[PDB]
Amino acid sequence: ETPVLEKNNVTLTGGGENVTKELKDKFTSGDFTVVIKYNQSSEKGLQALFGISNSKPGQQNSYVDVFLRDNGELGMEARDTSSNKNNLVSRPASVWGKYKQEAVTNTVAVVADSVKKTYSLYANGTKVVEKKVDNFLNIKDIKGIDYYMLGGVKRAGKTAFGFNGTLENIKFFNSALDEETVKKMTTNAVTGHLIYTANDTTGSNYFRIPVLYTFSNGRVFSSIDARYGGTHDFLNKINIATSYSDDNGKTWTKPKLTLAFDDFAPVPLEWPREVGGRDLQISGGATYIDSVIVEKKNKQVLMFADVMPAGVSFREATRKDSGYKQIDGNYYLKLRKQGDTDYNYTIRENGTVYDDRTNRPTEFSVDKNFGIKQNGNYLTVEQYSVSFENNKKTEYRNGTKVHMNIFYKDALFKVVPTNYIAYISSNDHGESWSAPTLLPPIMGLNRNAPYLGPGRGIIESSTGRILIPSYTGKESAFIYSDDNGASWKVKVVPLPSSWSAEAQFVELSPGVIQAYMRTNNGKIAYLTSKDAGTTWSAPEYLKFVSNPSYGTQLSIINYSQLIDGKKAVILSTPNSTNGRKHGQIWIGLINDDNTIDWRYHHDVDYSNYGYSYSTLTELPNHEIGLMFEKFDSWSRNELHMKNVVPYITFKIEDLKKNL
Numbered sequence: 002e003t004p005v006l007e008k009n010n011v012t013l014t015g016g017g018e019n020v021t022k023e024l025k026d027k028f029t030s031g032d033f034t035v036v037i038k039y040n041q042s043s044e045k046g047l048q049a050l051f052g053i054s055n056s057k058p059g060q061q062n063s064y065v066d067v068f069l070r071d072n073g074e075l076g077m078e079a080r081d082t083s084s085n086k087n088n089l090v091s092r093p094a095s096v097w098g099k100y101k102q103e104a105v106t107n108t109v110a111v112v113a114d115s116v117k118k119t120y121s122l123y124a125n126g127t128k129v130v131e132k133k134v135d136n137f138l139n140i141k142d143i144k145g146i147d148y149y150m151l152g153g154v155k156r157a158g159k160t161a162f163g164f165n166g167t168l169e170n171i172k173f174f175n176s177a178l179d180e181e182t183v184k185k186m187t188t189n190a191v192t193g194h195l196i197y198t199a200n201d202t203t204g205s206n207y208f209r210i211p212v213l214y215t216f217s218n219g220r221v222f223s224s225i226d227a228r229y230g231g232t233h234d235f236l237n238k239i240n241i242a243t244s245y246s247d248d249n250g251k252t253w254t255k256p257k258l259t260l261a262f263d264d265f266a267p268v269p270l271e272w273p274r275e276v277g278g279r280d281l282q283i284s285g286g287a288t289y290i291d292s293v294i295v296e297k298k299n300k301q302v303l304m305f306a307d308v309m310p311a312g313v314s315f316r317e318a319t320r321k322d323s324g325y326k327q328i329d330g331n332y333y334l335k336l337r338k339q340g341d342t343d344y345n346y347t348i349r350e351n352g353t354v355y356d357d358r359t360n361r362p363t364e365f366s367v368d369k370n371f372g373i374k375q376n377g378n379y380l381t382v383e384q385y386s387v388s389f390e391n392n393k394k395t396e397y398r399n400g401t402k403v404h405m406n407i408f409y410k411d412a413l414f415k416v417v418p419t420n421y422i423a424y425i426s427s428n429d430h431g432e433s434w435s436a437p438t439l440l441p442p443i444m445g446l447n448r449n450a451p452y453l454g455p456g457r458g459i460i461e462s463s464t465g466r467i468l469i470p471s472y473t474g475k476e477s478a479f480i481y482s483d484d485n486g487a488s489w490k491v492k493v494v495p496l497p498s499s500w501s502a503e504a505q506f507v508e509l510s511p512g513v514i515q516a517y518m519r520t521n522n523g524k525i526a527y528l529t530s531k532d533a534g535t536t537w538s539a540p541e542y543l544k545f546v547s548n549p550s551y552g553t554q555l556s557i558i559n560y561s562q563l564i565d566g567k568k569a570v571i572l573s574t575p576n577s578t579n580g581r582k583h584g585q586i587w588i589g590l591i592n593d594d595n596t597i598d599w600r601y602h603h604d605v606d607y608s609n610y611g612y613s614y615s616t617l618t619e620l621p622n623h624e625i626g627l628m629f630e631k632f633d634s635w636s637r638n639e640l641h642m643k644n645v646v647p648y649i650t651f652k653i654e655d656l657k658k659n660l
């Protein structure tokens with residue numbers, strides 16, 4: 002199939018270009034595909050890449066366009082005045098604006114298919130949306146089309162939605178092209194910045210909570226939440242996926258599921274984005290959520306994550322029970338057998354399940370990956386799938402048999418419905434991993450575990466103390482080990498208010514560490530310890546970030562090279578009171594007195610573009626890796642979007658801006 006019109010290198014500054022002669026009545030069937038490779042000179046205002054309209058007086062609601070907003074939303078309109086049919090199809094956060102001070106080339110497309118009555122939009126290799134509409138209009142359905150233009154829409158003799166930039170290449174076809182052809186046509190350099198993609202080797206359509214870490218051997222490692230039933234924190238099914246690079250982040254391994262349950266199949270699901278329907282959740286698979294990575298002195302790598310039993314959400318988890326008993330001074334994970342009210346059982350030595358009323362072993366045991374055996378044989382349960390087809394959610398037993406697990410809703414023995422922390426270890430830098438270990442009840446028997454602060458942990462240089470950041474909702478919990486991670490303890494620091502205090506650490510000088518964290522007051526807080534984390538200062542606040550009350554996670558890392566003759570820290574966060582937007586990377590130089598001079602910053606894209614959770618690492622060549630949620634992950638308008646967690650690289654000279 003060849004285009005009815007192809008144009009190259011059309012630079013426009015809001016005035017558009019008439020192409021009526023070269024497109025008039027060429028859309029025989031009425032269907033269309035338009036593929037546009039462009040870059041914007043300015044993101045301001047509502048801008049049309051092209052417009053097909055009735056330009057006559059009174060016919061201002063008779064047009065088709067593809068549009069861009071200042072927040073990266075890609076959409077299309079198809080409207081007819083006399084039928085009063087107004088179709089708008091879009092998805093937030095579909096395009097990129099600028100990157101390292103330069104306009105980004107995107108390639109987008111629209112397909113209108115009369116037989117299916119669907120409009121489809123594509124950006125940078127991804128089908129960002131396909132929607133069937135009852136009031137479907139093709140070009141022939143709109144009355145009195147007489148004007149076709151690039152970079153605007155002709156409404157009552159005036160150019161509306163003027164485009165500012167260059168249409169590097171634009172192709173108009175008079176048919177609906179197939180999905181695979183259009184994905185291929187829109188694939189470009191931007192496509193290559195995704196490490197995790199929808200329905201890759203994770204099986205997940207969605208992702209959140211990226212983490213980057215550079216190991217001692219030069220390997221750059223990533224982990225992420227693979228979130229299967231939309232991007233909901235809860236209820237959902239979530240696994241932790243991983244992917245790594247041995248060439249300074251240029252190429253990455255196909256992602257693997259590293260922490261995953263199998264009560265639910267890890268399947269690609271088309272989660273609804275409509276008002277109302279977008280609130281839909283599955284009934285909940287067992288879940289791993291919010292990963293934290295650290296490399297030990299001995300090069301062993303640890304990964305932590307929160308563990309959620311099936312159907313248990315952070316909102317519903319009981320705060321008054323750890324899920325453990327103490328018996329003869331040992332902490333044993335406790336179990337309730339189906340049909341009991343009390344928790345009468347414990348997992349003791351060798352995974353043997355004991356009846357605590359009699360202090361005798363039962364027929365039952367639990368292996369290192371939480372699977373239940375009876376007399377040495379695995380009990381099983383049937384896996385669940387989720388499906389739509391293509392309007393109504395169904396959960397059903399799918400014919401696959403998996404091991405019965407103490408975290409599953411169909412288990413004969415179940416854990417307390419609360420949150421836990423698990424960790425795993427690797428001796429080959431993330432190629433293979435141990436079985437999980439649940440953290441003992443460090444908060445006490447009658448409190449739930451803390452919640453991890455996603456990102457990294459650190460090794461404090463003077464003592465060797467390992468620090469893992471977490472929070473409870475009213476306190477900071479700094480989890481630590483003084484024996485190279487053989488045993489874990491905690492410092493609980495009460496906070497001014499009920500902050501979701503996701504934190505990250507930096508070391509200023511030997512023994513002096515600061516914990517930077519999310520608050521509920523709009524500011525980033527930092528607490529200071531001068532005894533390697535044993536005691537902490539009252540909070541102080543950065544003076545240059547102002548965010549909404551809900552706040553967002555941040556990333557801060559130490560940097561190994563001097564900047565302006567000084568030891569440096571590097572911080573990533575959104576900075577906007579309007580939402581999770583206006584991503585910034587800040588360089589802080591450490592003063593002789595261990596205060597920080599926040600001297601430089603660089604804006605990641607335009608200020609109304611989305612920016613939520615993020616993660617920084619120093620690459621082995623001293624460049625900076627960044628992976629981030631390129632959307633607003635709090636907004637109810639930006640839920641359940643595919644392919645929006647990119648990875649980018651900066652030289653320090655790219656970052657040394659604004660002073």
Ligand SMILES: CC(=O)N[C@H]1[C@H]([C@H](O)[C@H](O)CO)O[C@@](O)(C(=O)O)C[C@@H]1O
Pocket residue numbers: 047068076078089
């Ligand atoms: C993509 C989009 O939102 N288009 C809408 C526009 C713009 O909001 C404003 O023109 C601001 O540029 O406003 C309309 O009232 C209009 O012009 O008929 C409805 C239309 O659907």
